[PDB]
Design a binder for this molecule. Sequence first.
Ligand code: SF4
Ligand code: SF4
Lengths: 67, 315, 178, 385, 79, 56, 157, 92, 96
Amino acid sequence: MWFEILPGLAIMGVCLVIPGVSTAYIHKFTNGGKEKRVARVQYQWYLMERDRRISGVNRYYVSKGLE
Amino acid sequence: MFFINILTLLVPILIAMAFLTLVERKILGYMQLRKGPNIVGPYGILQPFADAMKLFMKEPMRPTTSMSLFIIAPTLSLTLALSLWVPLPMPHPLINLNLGILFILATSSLSVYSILWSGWASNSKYSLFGALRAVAQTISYEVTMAIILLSVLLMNGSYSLQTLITTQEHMWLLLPAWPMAMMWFISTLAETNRAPFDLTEGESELGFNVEYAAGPFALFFMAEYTNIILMNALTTIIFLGPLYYINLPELYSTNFMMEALLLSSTFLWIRASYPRFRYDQLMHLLWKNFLPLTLALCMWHISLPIFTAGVPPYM
Amino acid sequence: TYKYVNKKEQESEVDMKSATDNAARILMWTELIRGLGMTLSYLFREPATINYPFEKGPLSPRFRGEHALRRYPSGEERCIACKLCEAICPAQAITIEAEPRADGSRRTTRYDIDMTKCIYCGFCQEACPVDAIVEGPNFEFSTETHEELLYNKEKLLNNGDKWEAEIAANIQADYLYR
Amino acid sequence: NMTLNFGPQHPAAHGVLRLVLELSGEMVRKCDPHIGLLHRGTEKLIEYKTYLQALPYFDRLDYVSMMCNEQAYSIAVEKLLNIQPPPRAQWIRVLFGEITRILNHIMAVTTHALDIGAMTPFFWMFEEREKMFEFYERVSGARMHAAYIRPGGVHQDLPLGLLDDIYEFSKNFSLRIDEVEEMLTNNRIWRNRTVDIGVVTAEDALNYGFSGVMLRGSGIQWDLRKTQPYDVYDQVEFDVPIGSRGDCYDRYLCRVEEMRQSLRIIEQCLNKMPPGEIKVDDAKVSPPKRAEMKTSMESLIHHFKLYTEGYQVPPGATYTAIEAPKGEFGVYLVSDGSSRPYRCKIKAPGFAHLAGLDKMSKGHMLADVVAIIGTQDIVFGEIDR
Amino acid sequence: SAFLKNAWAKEPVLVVSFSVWGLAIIMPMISPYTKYASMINKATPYNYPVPVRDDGNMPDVPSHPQDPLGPSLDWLKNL
Amino acid sequence: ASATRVIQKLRNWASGQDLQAKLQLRYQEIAKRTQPPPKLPVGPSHKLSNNYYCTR
Amino acid sequence: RSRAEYVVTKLDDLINWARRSSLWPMTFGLACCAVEMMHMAAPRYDMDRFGVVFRASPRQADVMIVAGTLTNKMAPALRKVYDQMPEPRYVVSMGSCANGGGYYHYSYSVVRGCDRIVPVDIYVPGCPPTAEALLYGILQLQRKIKREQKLKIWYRR
Amino acid sequence: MNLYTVIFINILLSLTLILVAFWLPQRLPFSMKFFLVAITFLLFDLEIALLLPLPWAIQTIKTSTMMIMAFILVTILSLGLAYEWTQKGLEW
Amino acid sequence: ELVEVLKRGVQQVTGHGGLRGLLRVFFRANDIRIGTLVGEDKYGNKYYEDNKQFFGRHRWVIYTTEMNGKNTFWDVDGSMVPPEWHRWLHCMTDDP
Ligand code: SF4
Ligand code: SF4
C-alpha cells in the first residue's frame, strides 16, 4: 500500500527542515539572541561597525539609554 | 559555529538527496501497481545507501579519453548543485547575498559545461552528440528561465532571495504571475533533465553517463537529484511563498518542507505519466510556444508596476 | 464489417466557445493534467506484487516444470525402455541405452535428459506408455555449473522420489482430461 | 552521414537489431537494417523433424503470439491431410487465437511506449498479460510456448473452469485498455512523436508486401480473417479497425481497436463453444486417448507409430495464411509422402515490414527511427527464423 | 477575423502572446496611477536633503520639517 | 480492495472511472482450484458399428 | 570481537551485502526469454523490490542475463558487451537456448551455450524459464555473492 | 570568506568522492542548426543582460523613459526572433 | 475510518509474537501480516493463508530457522518448502 512510500519521504523531510531550523538558530546563538544583522548596504555595515566600537568588540552586545 | 552550519545545510540535504531516489522508486512503483524496493532494510530505507556502496566499489572503468575531464566534470556537477543551496533562504539563508538570484542563475548555467566536458571526454562519437543535446537545451531553456525570473524580480524589487519572504507576506506570487509559474515549472523540468524533457539518456541509450560508471556516475547522479530538489525549492520560495512568522522561523521551514516535497513529488509523478518529447519538439516548445509568451509577459511585468503605481521598494 | 479509427466524420467550424475550449486545452495543458490523475489514482491501488520466496505465483497441475522418472508403488522403476520418449523428443535431449536386467526384466542402463537441450515441450510426458517420465512441478532447479543441468537416471529417479507425492496428485487431477 | 551502427545499443530492442544508419547530425539519410542476429535455422531444422515435433518450433518463431503461429502450421498440416479439427477445437483455437492477439497488442502498444519513454502503461498491462499467461498455463501447462494447438485440433480439453475465468478477465480488461487510453491516446505528447511519422501510402503498402495493420492503417481493407475465413472466425462477428491518414498514431489506434474487437470475439466464443471432442477421431492423425492405448491393441499400435514415426502426410504443397497479430503469417509446407516435412518457409509478417523501414523513415530524426520500429511490432524471431 | 478565430484555437499562444504585448503597451498610457510611479519613487528619500541658507527671502521653503510648508506625501498616504 | 472509502473515492475520481467495480487484483472470484473431476465426451468414430475407416 | 580476522570478515560481509542488495541487470534481450523477464520486471514479480533495477546501460551493469539463443552472429557482440561491463560483473544464463543450445542446438548458426562465449555464474533452466524461476536464479546469484570472501583471501594471501 | 569557506568544503566533498571512487575499487558531427542556436542563445543572453538592470531601473525617477526603452528592447529582439522563425532558422 | 486501518495495523504488529517476533518477521520475511497457520511441516516451515487478500497473496510460507543443518534465518530460498506443501503454496491444489 502507498503508506510504505512514507517512510522514505519522512526521512527526506526531516532532512530538509534541519537545515532551515539549524541555520536559523546557529545565527541566533552566535549573534547573541538577536538575528544576525543583514548589511545589504554600507549604511548598515557602518551602523553595525559603529555598534562594535560602542561596546566590547562584538556588535551584538548592545548598550542602551543607561550609557 | 559557522562550520556546524555547513554540516547542517549539506549533510542533511545529502541524506535527503538519498531518500529522494527511494521515494522515486516507490511512488513510481505504486503508480505502476508494484510495491517498489521494500526488501532491503525496513520499507527500503537502507536501499539508497546500498547502491551507493555498490557504485563506489565497482571499477571506475575510466574506460581512450582526455583524463582530467573524466575526473573534473563529475566534480563540477556535484560542486555547483550542492553550492547553490548555500544561499537558499530557508528561513534565514546561510550566506545572504544581495544579488542572490543572479548567483543561482549563474551557478546553474555553469553545469551545462559538465555535460559538454563529459561528452567530449568519452571517445564515443555517439556521446559527443548526446552531450550536444543537453548542452543545447540547457542554454535554450536558460533563456526563458532567466527572463521568467527577471519578470519576478521586477515585482520583488531586488535580486536577493530574502526579499521575497517580505513580498509574499500577504499572498503567494502564484496568484499573480501564475502564467509564469507554469513556465517556471516546465523550465525547471527541462533544466533537471527530468522526464518530459529528458532527451539525454534517451534513445541514445535508454548520453553523458554512457561512459560513466561507479564513482563518476554517482557524483553527477547525486548532483541531478540534489538539483531536482533545489529547483523545486526555488519554486517553493519564488512562487509558492511559505507563511513567515518572525517570532517562530521554523513554520516557514516546515511549510517550505511541505511545498518542496509536494513539487518534488510532482516531477516524479510527471515522469511516470508522460512520454518523452522529441529533440526538436522540445526546442519548438521553448522558442516558439514559451519565449514569445515570456518576453511579452516580461513587458507586462515592467508595465504592471508603473501604471498600477506599484513600483516595488528597493531593499 | 469495418470501423474508421481517427477519421473525422465532418468539419466542425470553429465557434468561439469551441475555440476557447481548444485554446484552453493547449494553454493550460488540460489533457496533460488528465493523464496525471490516472497515475495518482493507481498510486492508491493495492500493488499486485508477491513476496517471491514467501508467496508463490500459482501454477496448476499441467505445469511442466522439471523432469522426473516415477516408480511403481512396489518400488520397481516404471520405465521399461521402449525408448519412444527418445523418439518423440524434439530436441534430441533424452539418450537411452538398455539391456535385460538380471531379473530378466527390461530396464534402461542409462537414461540421460540433457535439460539445457530440453525445451520442456512435455511430449515425453505424453508419449510414455507406462508414464514413467513426467513433467514434475518444480521449476526452481537453477545450477551453478553446466554439468549439473545434464541429468542421468540417478538424478531423475531421485527427483522422482522427492516429488512423487505431488506428481501423483498432479497426474491424479489431470488424467481424465488426457 | 556518419554511420552510427545504432541498435546493437539495445535502443528499440524487440530483439537485437543492428540498424546501420548514416546520419547528417540528427537526420537519418539512410537506414539499412541488418538481420540474422537471431537466425537459428528454424527452417532447416524442421526438415529433420517429424510434423508433431516441429510444432514446438512454430511457437518460438514469433513467441509473443505464441499460439496464433501454431494455428498456421496446424491449418497447413490439416489441409495436406484433408482433415479438419472437431467443432469444439475450432472455437478453442479462435478463443486462444484472440487471447493471443490481445497479448501481442499489449506487447506492441506498451513496448512502443517504453521506447518512446512512457513506462507506466507497460506495468499496467503486463499485469493483465500475466493473468492471461495463466490461462495458457492452465490450459497447456506452459505460460508461453504451450504446444496446445496441434495439427489435428487442440491437445487437451479446457480445464473444468477456465471459461469462467476467461470471462471475469474479459469482463474487466476493457477498463484496463481504457486507462492506457486516458494516458496515451490523447496525450498532448504521444500524438506529436507518433502523428505524421512513417506515413505509408496505400499503393506502396501493398507493393512492399506489408500485409498487416500496416496495410489496414493506410485504409486498405484487408483482414484475412474476414476475406478468407480460417477455423470458425467466420461464425463470429467483429469489425476490422481500418484507418485513415495512416501514420504511427493511426495504426496504434487500430491496434487498440483490435484489442477491443478481440474482446468482442472472445465473448462470443465463451457464449457459443460447443460440447464435443477436441481432437480429430482419426487415430491415423491424432494420438489415441491414454485410457484407449492402455486397453486396446489398435490404439497402442497407433500411439506407438504416431509418436515414433509420424502422420505420413500425403505428398503435396500448400501456402496457408492466417491473420497473426503482427500480420499475415503463412507456412509454405512442401511435403513428400514422408512423416517429416521437406520444406517449410515461414512467411513472417515482419520480414516485409522491416524492409519498409527504409521507405518509411526518410528525412527523420534518431527518435523517429525508434518510433517506427515500434509501429511494426518487429519480433526478430519471425524475421530471422 | 476568421483566421483570428482559428488562431485563437490553433497556435493559441502567439495570440495570447501578442495580446499581452499590447495590453502592456496600453495600460501604462491609460491609467489613473501611472503618474504616481514617477512620484512615489521620486519621493522615496535616499540621499540626505541638504538645507539651504536662510537669506530670509524665501517663504516657500519650510524652516522646519514639521512646518505647514513644503512638499507632502499625503498623496502617498491614503493612496 | 480493502481500501478506505476515501481512498477509493479519490481513486475513482483521479482515474475518472469506477475502478472498484473492475479491480485488477483477483479476490475469491477466480475459479477455485480442484474443480470437479472431468468426464470428457468421446467424439464420433467411436461407434462399434458402421465405423469403417475406409469411409472416414 | 577483537581480531584482524573478524574485522576483515565483517567488512566483506558489508561489501558483499552492497553488491548483493543492488544488482543492476544488463539483459541481452535475445529470443523470448527476455519476455519472461519483462514479466519479472512487471508487477506480479517485481525485481526492483529486490534491488535489481529494471534496465541499466552496459557500462552500468552488475549482472548480464543472456536470454535467448546466442547465434554465431551475436556471439562476437555478447563478448564485447561482457568485456565492456565494469569489473565486478556476473552472468546469468537464462533459457535452454542460452545455457546449452536447446532446441537449435544442432543448428549451424547457434552457439551451443553462452558458456562458450562468456563465463556463466547461474544457469536458469526452462524453455521460457518461468519468471519466478529467473527470480530464484537471481536470488541464487545473491546467495553466491554472499559466500564470496575477497577481503579474507587478500588478508591470508 | 564565508563564501570561500563553504565553496572549498564543496569542492573538497566532491574531490573526496571521486578520489575514493578511483581508489576504493582496489568526429564530424555538425549541423549549422546547432551552431545557429548557440549564436541566437548569446544574442538572447546579451539581451538578458541589458534587461537585468531593470529591477534597479524601475526605481528611476524618469519611469516613462525606462518603460519606453525596455519595451523597445524587448520588441526589437522579439522581431529578431520573428525573422528567425520566418527564415529557416528555428525550424531545425 | 482511518482509525479502523490503524487498528488492524496494531493487530498485525502485536500479532506476530512480541517485538522479537515482529522483528523476526519484519526483517526476514519483510511483511507484517497475520494469517491462519494452515500447518507446520517437519522441516519447520510454517504456512499461512489469508483468503481476504488477493489471489496472489493469500497463501504464504514463513520459512524455518534451520533446514537440513544450514541456517535459514536470512538465507531463505524457495526450495526450502517441502514437495508435499509446494503445490499448496503454488495453488496447484486447494487442499492443505
Ligand atoms: S517412454 Fe516412458 S517408459 Fe518408454 S522409455 Fe521413455 S520413459 Fe521409459
Ligand atoms: S530457451 Fe526456449 S524460450 Fe528461451 S529462447 Fe531458446 S527457445 Fe525461446
